[PDB]
Design an enzyme around this catalytic site. Sequence first.
Site, PDB file in Angstrom:
ATOM      1  N   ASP A   1      -0.606 -10.605  -0.875  1.00 20.42           N
ATOM      2  CA  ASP A   1      -1.450 -10.760  -0.931  1.00 20.42           C
ATOM      3  C   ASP A   1      -1.973 -12.114  -2.344  1.00 20.42           C
ATOM      4  O   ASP A   1      -3.051 -12.179  -2.239  1.00 20.42           O
ATOM      5  CB  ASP A   1      -1.587  -9.430  -1.604  1.00 20.42           C
ATOM      6  CG  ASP A   1      -1.606  -8.354  -1.010  1.00 20.42           C
ATOM      7  OD1 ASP A   1      -2.468  -7.391  -0.569  1.00 20.42           O
ATOM      8  OD2 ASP A   1      -0.262  -7.964  -1.338  1.00 20.42           O
TER       9      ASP A   1
ATOM     10  N   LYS B   1       3.928  -2.968   6.749  1.00 18.07           N
ATOM     11  CA  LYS B   1       4.862  -4.369   6.916  1.00 18.07           C
ATOM     12  C   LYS B   1       6.875  -3.374   6.838  1.00 18.07           C
ATOM     13  O   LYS B   1       7.179  -3.777   8.075  1.00 18.07           O
ATOM     14  CB  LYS B   1       4.835  -4.994   5.554  1.00 18.07           C
ATOM     15  CG  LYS B   1       3.616  -6.350   5.606  1.00 18.07           C
ATOM     16  CD  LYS B   1       3.726  -7.219   4.346  1.00 18.07           C
ATOM     17  CE  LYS B   1       3.874  -6.445   2.463  1.00 18.07           C
ATOM     18  NZ  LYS B   1       3.060  -5.714   2.642  1.00 18.07           N
TER      19      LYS B   1
ATOM     20  N   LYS C   1       6.956  -3.212  -5.027  1.00 17.86           N
ATOM     21  CA  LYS C   1       7.522  -2.173  -4.502  1.00 17.86           C
ATOM     22  C   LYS C   1       9.065  -1.332  -4.390  1.00 17.86           C
ATOM     23  O   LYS C   1       9.172  -0.688  -4.797  1.00 17.86           O
ATOM     24  CB  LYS C   1       6.382  -1.494  -2.951  1.00 17.86           C
ATOM     25  CG  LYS C   1       5.941   0.120  -3.321  1.00 17.86           C
ATOM     26  CD  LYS C   1       5.012  -0.397  -2.476  1.00 17.86           C
ATOM     27  CE  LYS C   1       4.360   1.478  -2.256  1.00 17.86           C
ATOM     28  NZ  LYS C   1       4.697   2.271  -0.940  1.00 17.86           N
TER      29      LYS C   1
ATOM     30  N   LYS D   1      -0.621  -8.251   4.392  1.00 15.66           N
ATOM     31  CA  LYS D   1      -1.335  -7.216   2.611  1.00 15.66           C
ATOM     32  C   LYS D   1      -0.716  -6.314   2.050  1.00 15.66           C
ATOM     33  O   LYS D   1      -0.258  -5.451   3.770  1.00 15.66           O
ATOM     34  CB  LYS D   1      -2.884  -7.292   2.572  1.00 15.66           C
ATOM     35  CG  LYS D   1      -3.516  -6.721   3.930  1.00 15.66           C
ATOM     36  CD  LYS D   1      -5.450  -5.812   3.607  1.00 15.66           C
ATOM     37  CE  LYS D   1      -5.243  -5.260   2.585  1.00 15.66           C
ATOM     38  NZ  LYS D   1      -4.262  -4.272   1.988  1.00 15.66           N
TER      39      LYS D   1
HETATM   40  N1  LIG Z   1       1.573   2.617  13.407  1.00 20.75           N
HETATM   41  C1  LIG Z   1       1.435   3.512  12.378  1.00 20.75           C
HETATM   42  N2  LIG Z   1       0.667   4.645  12.309  1.00 20.75           N
HETATM   43  C2  LIG Z   1       0.772   5.548  10.565  1.00 20.75           C
HETATM   44  N3  LIG Z   1       1.111   5.589   9.530  1.00 20.75           N
HETATM   45  C3  LIG Z   1       1.510   3.965  10.003  1.00 20.75           C
HETATM   46  C4  LIG Z   1       1.380   2.696  10.619  1.00 20.75           C
HETATM   47  N4  LIG Z   1       2.550   2.127   9.962  1.00 20.75           N
HETATM   48  C5  LIG Z   1       1.882   2.433   8.396  1.00 20.75           C
HETATM   49  N5  LIG Z   1       1.998   3.939   8.462  1.00 20.75           N
HETATM   50  C6  LIG Z   1       1.931   4.525   7.054  1.00 20.75           C
HETATM   51  O1  LIG Z   1       0.880   3.510   6.090  1.00 20.75           O
HETATM   52  C7  LIG Z   1       1.543   3.420   5.212  1.00 20.75           C
HETATM   53  C8  LIG Z   1       1.559   1.898   4.288  1.00 20.75           C
HETATM   54  O2  LIG Z   1       3.031   1.157   4.557  1.00 20.75           O
HETATM   55  P1  LIG Z   1       4.225   0.828   4.954  1.00 20.75           P
HETATM   56  O3  LIG Z   1       5.097  -0.612   6.131  1.00 20.75           O
HETATM   57  O4  LIG Z   1       4.297   0.692   3.947  1.00 20.75           O
HETATM   58  O5  LIG Z   1       2.663  -1.046   3.969  1.00 20.75           O
HETATM   59  P2  LIG Z   1       2.849  -2.113   3.574  1.00 20.75           P
HETATM   60  O6  LIG Z   1       4.966  -1.740   3.442  1.00 20.75           O
HETATM   61  O7  LIG Z   1       2.981  -3.380   4.289  1.00 20.75           O
HETATM   62  O8  LIG Z   1       2.240  -1.918   1.642  1.00 20.75           O
HETATM   63  C9  LIG Z   1       2.792   4.379   4.904  1.00 20.75           C
HETATM   64  O9  LIG Z   1       2.871   5.223   4.252  1.00 20.75           O
HETATM   65  C10 LIG Z   1       2.990   4.110   6.421  1.00 20.75           C
HETATM   66  O10 LIG Z   1       3.657   5.498   6.591  1.00 20.75           O
HETATM   67 MG   LIG Z   2       6.120  -2.137   1.917  1.00 20.37          MG
END
Ligand SMILES: Nc1ncnc2c1ncn2[C@@H]1O[C@H](COP(=O)(O)OP(=O)(O)O)[C@@H](O)[C@H]1O
Ligand SMILES: [Mg+2]
Lengths: 276, 276
Positions: B129, B15, B41, B10
Site C-alpha cells: 500500500d 497476497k 499482519k 494492496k
Molecule cells: N481466490 C480466492 N477465493 C476466495 N477467497 C480468497 C481468495 N484469495 C483470497 N481470499 C480470501 O481473501 C482474504 C484476504 O486474503 P490474503 O491473502 O490474506 O490478503 P493479503 O495477504 O493480500 O492481505 C482471505 O480471507 C482469503 O481467504
Molecule cells: Mg497477507
Amino acid sequence: AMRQCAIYGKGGIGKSTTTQNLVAALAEMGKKVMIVGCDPKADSTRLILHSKAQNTIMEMAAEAGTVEDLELEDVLKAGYGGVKCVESGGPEPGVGCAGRGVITAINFLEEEGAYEDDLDFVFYDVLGDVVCGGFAMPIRENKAQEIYIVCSGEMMAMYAANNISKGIVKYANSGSVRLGGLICNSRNTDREDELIIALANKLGTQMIHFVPRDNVVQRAEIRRMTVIEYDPKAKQADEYRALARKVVDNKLLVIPNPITMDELEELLMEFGIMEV
Amino acid sequence: AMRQCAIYGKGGIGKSTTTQNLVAALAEMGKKVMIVGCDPKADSTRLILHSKAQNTIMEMAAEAGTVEDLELEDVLKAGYGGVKCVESGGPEPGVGCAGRGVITAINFLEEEGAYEDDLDFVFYDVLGDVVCGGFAMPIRENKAQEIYIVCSGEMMAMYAANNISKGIVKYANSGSVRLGGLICNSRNTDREDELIIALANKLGTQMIHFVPRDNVVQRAEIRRMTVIEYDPKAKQADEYRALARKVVDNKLLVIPNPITMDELEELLMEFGIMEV
Ligand SMILES: Nc1ncnc2c1ncn2[C@@H]1O[C@H](COP(=O)(O)OP(=O)(O)O)[C@@H](O)[C@H]1O
Ligand SMILES: [Mg+2]
Ligand SMILES: Nc1ncnc2c1ncn2[C@@H]1O[C@H](COP(=O)(O)OP(=O)(O)O)[C@@H](O)[C@H]1O
Ligand SMILES: [Mg+2]
C-alpha cells in the site's frame, strides 16, 4: 469552535467516497467544511471540485520554490456547497517516506490561517494501511480529535480498524484524539451490519452508520460528483444525509479497547461471513 | 541457483493466500522453498505451519536480547512439504516505521546462511500500500529479482500495481529487480480477466494467471491449510498448480512502463467494470 475529524481505513474501503459525500451533506445542511487529503492517491477532493483531482501542496511547493512561497488563497480550492479542499501529496513510490507530505501540508495550513473561526468541520482523509510517519501525525500530534474508521465485514478492513485503534491508545496520554465510531461501507454480505456493530462494541465505540453498496455511487463518480449533487433524490443520498446527521449529533468519543486476532476471527465465525 | 521472488499488492488482495498456495504447489512438485513474511499482519506462513501465525524475528529478538542472540535454526520453521517459513514482524501502530522489521529480518537471514544452495525459490510476501521504508527494501536493495503483483479489477488494486511498478523503475539503474507478472485474484466481475491482461500489456508484462474466487479457500483456511493440502482434488488446487507451473516456466522479467491515472480510468470504462 470547529470539530476536527479524520476518516481512516484500509485502502479502497471507501474513505474518499464516504468523506466527500458526508461533507456534501453537511454543506447542504449549511455547515462550512474543509477537506484535507492525507492519502498519496490524492483524489480525495475531486468529487467536490468536479475535477480529475487537485494539485498537491508538495507539487505546488516544488514549482514555487519552497512551501513558504505558497499562498493559502492559491492552495485551497472551493467546490460544491462552498466546501474548501486541499491535497497534501507525497513522494513518488520508492522515494522517501510516503507520509511526509501530510506533515508539510498540515503545518502549512495551520501557519497560514486556514483554520478560520467560521469553519464548522475539518475532515482529514488519511491512508490507514500503516500507522506511521505522516499518516500517524494527525493522531500523534493531536490534529484530529474525532477519528471515524471506514470498514466492512472484510477481515482486512477490521484488522485495519483495530490497528488504527491501537495508534489512538498509544497517544492517549496527551492530546485529545479519540475514536468516534465505525462506518460500515457495505459489501452486500449477510449479517455485515451485525458484525460491525459487534466489533464497535468490543472496541468501546459504535457503528455510526451502515452505508449500503449502491451503483449510483459509480454513476455519480464517473461524472466527478458526490451522490448528494448528482442525484439529491437518490436513496443513497439519504443514506449520506443520515450519516451526516449522526456525525453532527455524536457525543461518544472514547479511548478504544483494541482486540486480539482471536477475537477478530471469532467475530467472523459468529456472523457466518466466511461461510456465506 | 535460486530464484528470489516477491509478491506485492494492496492489503487484503490475496497476497498471503496466493503465495502459500503457490508455494505448496511448488513443494508438491518437488521444489525447495522459503517464505519470508514482510507484512506487519504477520500471518503469511500460518497455512504452511498449520498455525495461528508465527512468532516474528522482531518479537524473538526482543525476548533474546539482540537479533544476534537468535539462531537461524530457532527462527526458521518448516511446515507442509518441507517449506521453510519466517516472519519479519514490525513495530506496533503509531510506534516507528511500519517496515523496519523487514530490513532486520532480511539482513539476519542473509548473515546467518538461510540462503542455502539447495533452495529453489524464496518468496517475500510484502505489504504494497506504500512503497517506502522496509517495504521498498526488497526492491531498493536488490533482494527480489522477480516481482509478481496480485491485483483485481478493483481500481485501488490496479493503482497499487502501478505504484509498485514505479518503484521498480526508480531502482532499475542498479541491481536486477524486474516485474515478472500480474496475478489476477478474481472478484467475480465480468471481463476482469480481459482487464488485467490489458493492464499487464500497458505495463509491459503479462497476466501470469487468473485465480478464480472460490469458497474452498475459506474452508481450507478455517482449518489452517492451503487448498493444496486441504483438498488436493479441488478445482482451485489445480488453479494454484497452473499458476505454479507458469511461474516456474516464466522468462519475461521487464522494467515496466507505469501508466497515468487517465489510462487506468480508460481501462475501467473500456471493460465495463464500473458499469457491471
Ligand atoms: N481466490 C480466492 N477465493 C476466495 N477467497 C480468497 C481468495 N484469495 C483470497 N481470499 C480470501 O481473501 C482474504 C484476504 O486474503 P490474503 O491473502 O490474506 O490478503 P493479503 O495477504 O493480500 O492481505 C482471505 O480471507 C482469503 O481467504
Ligand atoms: Mg497477507
Ligand atoms: N457505498 C458504495 N457503493 C458503491 N460503490 C462504492 C461505495 N463506496 C465506495 N465505492 C467505490 O469504491 C471505490 C473505492 O472507494 P474510495 O472512497 O476511493 O476508497 P479509499 O478512499 O478508501 O481508497 C470507488 O470506486 C468508489 O466509487
Ligand atoms: Mg481515497
